[PDB]
Design an enzyme around this catalytic site. Structure first.
Site, short mmCIF file in Angstrom:
data_model
loop_
_atom_site.label_atom_id
_atom_site.label_comp_id
_atom_site.label_asym_id
_atom_site.label_seq_id
_atom_site.Cartn_x
_atom_site.Cartn_y
_atom_site.Cartn_z
N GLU A 235 0.80 -1.17 0.11
CA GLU A 235 -0.06 0.11 -0.01
C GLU A 235 1.00 1.30 -0.08
OE1 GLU A 235 -3.73 -0.22 0.14
OE2 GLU A 235 -2.64 -1.72 -0.98
N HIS B 19 2.24 1.65 -3.54
CA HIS B 19 1.19 2.41 -4.37
C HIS B 19 1.12 3.84 -4.10
CE1 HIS B 19 -1.18 -1.72 -3.99
NE2 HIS B 19 -0.29 -1.64 -4.85
N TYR C 256 1.81 7.36 -6.62
CA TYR C 256 0.93 8.36 -6.96
C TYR C 256 1.92 9.65 -7.34
CZ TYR C 256 -3.05 5.64 -6.41
OH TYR C 256 -4.06 4.59 -6.28
N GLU D 136 -4.63 -4.62 -5.18
CA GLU D 136 -5.72 -4.27 -4.51
C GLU D 136 -6.71 -5.44 -4.81
OE1 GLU D 136 -6.02 -1.65 -2.22
OE2 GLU D 136 -3.91 -2.11 -2.92
N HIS E 174 -5.82 -8.16 -2.57
CA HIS E 174 -6.03 -7.58 -1.18
C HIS E 174 -7.38 -7.91 -0.52
CE1 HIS E 174 -2.23 -4.81 -1.06
NE2 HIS E 174 -1.91 -5.96 -1.48
#
Lengths: 285, 285
Positions: free
Chosen positions: B93, B96, B100, B195, B198
């Site tokens: 996470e 991720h 961005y 995701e 997940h």
């Protein structure tokens, strides 16, 4: 509510440590261990037993750091970039713990492996020191913690990853330094490579929180830190005597423990409190 | 105290999910985004603004999952192999969230990026959505939790990763499906690939806990789950109206939200509650 923004630095080191942790990424599938069988069998029963026991103790350490230490420290951090790094470090602790099972699969039968983990779960000294460490983490199971509590959990973390682990890292390195179990030794070197930067990074964060404390709080945790250091040291000397008397290495391991205790103190910006074995050094090569 | 032992399975799925998470490992440096500038400049101001806003909303989601959701769910788990998988997921996470910022670096100036993150931090709907989800996580900041509390934190987690994110994933995927911002779109596809598994994994863990609850507790959390689902839905419908009215996509996104709400419910072993855009489908290709 804030989202992490890496285009604006929250500190001067999280980015470099993030990059280094990723750069050092590895998994157990990358190191085949079957070739260790040829030197495994040259060891005595007592040597094999010491090896399995210290790897079992190391696995317990990584289980607690990935599953408790890093989560509860990071959840209370306000620095979102530093938080990211700790999360990655906790995942790598679980990679480490899994890599120990990869070694076991080649060296031991299924029944022997269950013996190991049952010995770990019931071992009084492992219970005592893992329990001292995790008591500092469990203090963080509440909505608001004090900086004293967060600082001391960071101290506990550095002392585990920079210090208490090395009573166990000693023997794989010592054997690798003599040409024995060298593929497992490369795995242990990868683990150590991560643990070193884990200890440095948490120590930096700790020094930052220490500088934010009141004078009274600083005096309290300075004393607690020195007490904790020597409480763990006393326990570790009982551990090394139990593990290593059978193979004549008790005092050599103790010297390694004191050496790494000094490094953990320095990771915390503290002075050494104790005064490397050349075979171990050759195992680090 | 137990160490994780991967030579003895604690469940029938953690090893497979461990291996897949590892197999899927990536970081942002693998995808250069500079070539997106040539389609970025073709978007209108309103389109560029929506894009920056939804990526900022997505970053906040990952910031809370890696830094709060995964740590507070995993720490109370008794299954040490499942604990390991979640720790790795929380680390991804953070990969991720950092990816961005890598996109922002190519598309926005330093000043425009800080505008984005200030808009995220003060935004009332984002604050409300993140506040509801993380309130389930903060209930786990105590030494002893109930299975109801752990179950509803897992529900919150599935709803964020399988459901609430998709009001934001819609637009990068919609643009990539048309040949615009395709390198950023490849990053978004790698994020989605993580995701998806997940939400599946946490959903499996929720169903295991659910089967241990008393019937009265099961019915209580079923009611909470349905109410939470629709409370979030109401907020998302206000969020899509705010983000997407300027660019005429409100009802398209709403349909995407209902589709992924249904997937989140199914991840939990629950029945769908609502009745894919073909360009979005092409952006997933």
């Amino acid at each position: 509510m804030r989202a992490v923004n890496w285009n604006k630095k929250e500190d001067d080191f999280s980015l470099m440590f993030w990059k280094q942790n990723i750069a050092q990424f590895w998994t157990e599938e990358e190191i085949a261990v079957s070739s260790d069988k040829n030197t495994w069998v040259q060891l005595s029963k007592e040597e094999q037993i010491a090896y399995k026991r210290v790897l079992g103790g190391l696995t317990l350490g990584d289980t607690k750091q990935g599953g408790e230490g890093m989560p509860l420290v990071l959840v209370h951090l306000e620095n979102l970039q530093a938080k990211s790094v700790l999360a990655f470090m906790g995942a790598m602790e679980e990679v480490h713990a899994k890599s120990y099972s990869h070694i076991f699969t080649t060296l031991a039968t299924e029944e022997e492996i269950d013996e190991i983990f049952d010995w770990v779960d019931t071992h009084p000294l492992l219970e005592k020191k893992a329990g001292i460490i995790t008591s500092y983490y469990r203090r963080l199971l509440k909505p608001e913690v004090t900086k004293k509590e967060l600082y001391m959990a960071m101290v506990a973390s550095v002392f585990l990853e920079s210090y208490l682990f090395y009573s166990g890292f000693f023997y794989p390195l010592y054997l690798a330094g003599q040409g024995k179990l060298t593929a497992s030794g490369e795995i242990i070197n990868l683990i150590i490579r991560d643990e070193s930067i884990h200890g440095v990074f948490v120590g930096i964060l700790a020094q930052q929180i220490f500088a934010e404390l009141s004078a009274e709080d600083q005096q309290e945790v300075q004393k607690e830190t020195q007490e904790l250091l020597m409480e763990l040291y006393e326990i570790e000397m009982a551990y090394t005597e139990e593990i290593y008397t059978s193979i004549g290495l008790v005092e050599d391991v103790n010297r390694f423990v004191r050496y790494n205790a000094n490094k953990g103190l320095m990771n915390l910006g503290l002075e050494p409190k104790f005064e490397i074995n050349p075979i171990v050094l050759n195992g680090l090569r």
